[PDB]
From a paper:
The potent neurotoxic venom of the black widow spider contains a cocktail of seven phylum-specific latrotoxins (LTXs), but only one, α-LTX, targets vertebrates. This 130 kDa toxin binds to receptors at presynaptic nerve terminals and triggers a massive release of neurotransmitters. Each monomer is composed of an N-terminal four-helix connector domain (CD; residues E21–D115), a central helical bundle domain (HBD; residues S116–K350), a short β-sheet plug domain (PD; residues Q351–D453) and a C-terminal tail of 22 ARs (ARD; residues I454–G1195).
In the second state, the HBDs are moved closer together, forming tight interactions that result in the narrow conformation of the central core. The CD assumes a dramatically different conformation and is completely folded out of its pocket. The four N-terminal CDs are remodeled in an extended coiled-coil needle, whereas the C-terminal domains preserve their overall arrangement. The distal end of the tetrameric coiled-coil needle is formed by the most N-terminal region of the protein (helices α1–α3 in state 1) and might correspond to the transmembrane region of the pore. This domain however is flexible and not resolved in the cryo-EM structure, as might be expected in the absence of a lipid environment or detergents. The particles show characteristic mushroom-like structures resembling the cryo-EM structure of state 2 with the (N-terminal) tip of their needle inserted into the membrane. We, therefore, conclude that the mushroom-like cryo-EM structure of state 2 indeed represents the pore state of α-LTX. During prepore to pore transition, helix α5 separates from the HBD and undergoes a reorientation of almost 180 degrees. This way, it forms an intriguing rigid tetrameric coiled-coil with the α5 helices of the other three monomers. In addition, helix α4 of the CD folds into a continuous helix with α5. In this manner, the coiled-coil elongates, positioning the N-terminal helices α1–α3 of the CD at its lower end to form the transmembrane domain (TMD).
Numbering used by the authors:
A (entry chain B): 283 to 543
B (entry chain C): 152 to 1065
C (entry chain D): 152 to 282
Write the structure that this text describes.
Amino acid sequence: LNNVFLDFKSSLVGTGTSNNEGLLDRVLQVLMTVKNSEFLGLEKNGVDEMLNEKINLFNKIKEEIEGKQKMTLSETPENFAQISFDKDITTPIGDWRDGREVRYAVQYASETLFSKISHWSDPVSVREKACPTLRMPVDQTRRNVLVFRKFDSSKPQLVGEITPYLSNFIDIDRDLYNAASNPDSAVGFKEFTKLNYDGANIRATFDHGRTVFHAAAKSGNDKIMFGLTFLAKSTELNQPDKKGYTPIHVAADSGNAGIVN
Amino acid sequence: SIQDAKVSPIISKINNFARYFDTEKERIRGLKLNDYILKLEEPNGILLHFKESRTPTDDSLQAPLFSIIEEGYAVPKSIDDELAFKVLYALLYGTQTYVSVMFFLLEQYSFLANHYYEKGYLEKYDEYFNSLNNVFLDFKSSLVGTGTSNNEGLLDRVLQVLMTVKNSEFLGLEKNGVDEMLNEKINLFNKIKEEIEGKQKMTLSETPENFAQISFDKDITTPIGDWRDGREVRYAVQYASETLFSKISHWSDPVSVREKACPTLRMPVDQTRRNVLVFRKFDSSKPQLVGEITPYLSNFIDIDRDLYNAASNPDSAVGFKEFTKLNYDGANIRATFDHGRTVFHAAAKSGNDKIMFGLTFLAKSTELNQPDKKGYTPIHVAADSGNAGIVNLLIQRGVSINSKTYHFLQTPLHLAAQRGFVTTFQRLMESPEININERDKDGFTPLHYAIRGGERILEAFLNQISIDVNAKSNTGLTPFHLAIIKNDWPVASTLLGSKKVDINAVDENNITALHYAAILGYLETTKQLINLKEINANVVSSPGLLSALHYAILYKHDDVASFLMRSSNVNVNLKALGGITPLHLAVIQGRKQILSLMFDIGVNIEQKTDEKYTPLHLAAMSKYPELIQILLDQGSNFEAKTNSGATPLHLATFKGKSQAALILLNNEVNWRDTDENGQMPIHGAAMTGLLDVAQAIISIDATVVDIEDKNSDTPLNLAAQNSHIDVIKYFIDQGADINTRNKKGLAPLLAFSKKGNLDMVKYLFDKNANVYIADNDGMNFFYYAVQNGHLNIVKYAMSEKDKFEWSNTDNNRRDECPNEECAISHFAVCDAVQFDRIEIVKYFVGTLGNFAICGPLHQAARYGHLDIVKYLVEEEFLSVDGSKTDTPLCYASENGHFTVVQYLVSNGAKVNHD
Amino acid sequence: SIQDAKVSPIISKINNFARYFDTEKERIRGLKLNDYILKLEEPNGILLHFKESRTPTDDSLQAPLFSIIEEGYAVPKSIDDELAFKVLYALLYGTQTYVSVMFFLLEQYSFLANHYYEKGYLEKYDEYFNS
């Protein structure tokens, strides 16, 4: 998309004035030459007026192309500067497996324009540690950045959002989210309890605004829902998503009768 | 037409390919970085098409080139239209595009190969290396050939065609010049041929030999390091060429590991005796560099790189334990990897304090300050990573704080400012002998990178007691300048609040940051700084005396300019160099609403430049005609005067803009007003060559057909000199008087003879206009006609023998030459001999019955022309003595021409004769 | 002139293909071993072009010769039919180049086949076998 937009835009009018100035100006020039040529009284005078309205249409579309803005963002943010497993956690929790490698990527967060995802970082072997700490340089343009994580060649997963003036990026939020969304019940409950004891926020947002409550509703776990509903303020239980789905909507879609009651 | 049909496809294709390549060349050269990468990496883009451009396919280059070469249509056939020459130029232009595409492909493939080699992605690096090698070899063979053989190459064939055209020599009035820059093209082709022969391959194709044996003699327990049970290991070898690229060899067979971790491998001795780098890969993960082999090294152990990964491990306790185990087993620390990288640098990258603490004991000062090939000292890497404990340990060891990097000269303080970590700076300030500011390649202070870092680093720097806020770089940009050009207002506000900053600071060209904001059209920043801060907006730049409003108006930035003119803080009467006022500059840009707004605010309509030009005149001096209409609707002086008195209609006719003249006539601007020279605008219209204005002015007043300025030259004479058919035909449709003369005495017939068109000549001769017209000097039309050397006008003149008589002679020429009563034909032949044009002399000889009356030998001896004298002595059989007692040898001796005298002596003429 | 214009594109194309193939025939043979494999293994190399040369596309080899034989312009008509002998010679040249290009790719494909066979690499060996 980026290539075709830039290249076609250069073809029509050009990114800058030059000896060619696009093919539209050549069409205008040849039409002006036709005007300068001798014309008939009535009939190809009508041809003259229809080519005049064609010239008006060409001017309008040329102005639209010049005023047309780019729908993509070729600029790319910077990856993490240093990584360290400072947290005292044991490895066999969540997707963190011995002998596995993790690749991180960053992308600009633009609401109206598409943004390029950065090249994946160098592989990092994981052993005896599960929760990594990422340190990020301050953004040049001061834009919030989405962060993506990939294990080996599996499905990449969005993991969080970084503000321009935040550097100490801890990686526990998506681990908790997957703990609440795991198909299993007992293992998911135990690892959720371990992560909660470790320390992780609840209002984290993923997948168009879904929350640990939405993940619990979709998975169908009952013990974690019972643990969460205690000391839970009613606003988060009715928190809607970007599309507008609520936890009860997700529960109805999943079809889990217990969480419904 | 048939030949044109035959040649149109190939010529259209070559022209289209050439223009496409040129447009893409500038487009690609004008791109950004990620844009460059995306465009160059397109699966089906211009790189593959350019590689296929040397294929024998239809749309390629070589097929049209060899087709036009073989068919032989480039060589002209006698004299014809400009089609053989045009296809020849097309061939030359296509060959130039071919060699330019060759260089284009070389440079971009080399850049791609380097860009993917620096990262370490060998899979794409190998593909780009092969592409570059194939492109180089194929294009070198296609241009000149691998050797002198029957193929002969392509440029040699082009030169052969050029010599064939040169020896064709059908005509030479201009073709000797044409073939002359064809010889220049031949020299250029020879130069580029010598360049490509002298150019060497940038790729080393030959690959080394892999290891001959593998062993696991060393007793290392397998879980340690990157050694995983059940994981395959592969090795590759590459030549270490500092100047050229080297191919990576094919990977070795998978090798399984179990209970052993450190392998011992044996390498054969290389024949060329060059060091070879060894690459190691685990499964499909990222390949790593494990070491280098000297020509006379047999055993290689990769334990050195394993220690490098041990020091770079993200974990702390496991990394320290494995480092201790490897040190106990025995591994050197002086080993280098990647971009000349050092183990201490890896320890700095990891940030593990344990390995640093262990290494500093029994260390050396030079090792702690040892840089890589890029000049990144360990403190540089520590500052870039952002760790604090390793920095504190390094300071306690007394490392060099003023370490600098090659090429881009940056201290670790610059790295900290760019990254934006206030902790690293606040830990570095306890180090003594530290310098607050440094001079970079552009002299950029660390504050210039802190403003990029963020607000917190700026607060940290401004909190320091020792800081130079008004630092000036080599380019001349103060910190405020490039802090505000980036549009981060909060950081600029933080900088201003902490301590006073010289807002009125200027560059060498007297450029203020406000001027940058105006020229770049960020209106919000301009409003913020104008309202909440005080600034002198009347400062002018050093070149051109341009101001803030001028910069805002330039490059069509209308909102900012409107905001500035709405505010009363900045004035409008300010005058720049050249006299261009805000009204004049808005006219140059041609924006309407800006002019309407500044007229609403209030300004004099008749602003004056240095030369008193009225804004209406400059509105005529613009591509937008609506400016004249809007100015006259708002009210403007129709008869406004300048220092030269030039009227807007005068200027419009001088430039020749038809729309301006049409709208001025529609608005009925008086044409009576003249300039200082008194020239009527019809004179400028004739200069440009506009006709509709001529009919309009004749309709308004027919008297202007013979109007004259102080130059006293009629418009008909000027139109004839300008060589425009329409105006001359028009004035002869009214039929202006032919006897009108200026002070120079030039006549329209003189200009027609200068142009040489036979149609006007036959109208003038049928009009029976006198050809004996003379000016104050006394020269006549006949002399200029003979000087022009136009034969067919002369034939048509002698066809009507009634109007001109050869026997009759002009009396004025008899008066000017009382001694020689030469006739018109006689003296004309003698002048033709004087003109040194042999063709004209032989023309007159053919027309005139007896050429001996002029005595061409004596005249030629007087003029000292070798060729004429030789031709008349040999082919005309002219007697050397001549009818007169004076020999031409006396004239030749008087003139002193060498070859003429030698030839006359060889003819038998004697110098002894009186 | 019209007859020459009619036969100009096909004769030019067949001559270009013939001379290009003759040049590459000794270009490839005199190339070093390491560059030989790299030159052959180009994704859009000359081997793919030679394989496509059998297709009925305009740029391929058959369309000129088949057009010549179908239209019957190779047979001289009347005296001084210079174009007839020219297109006939082009036809024989095209047939010779077609036979030589058929004999060409077999050696390189067989060589790639066993060269990869010695070290395994059966994924590429299967592709070369099919080719």
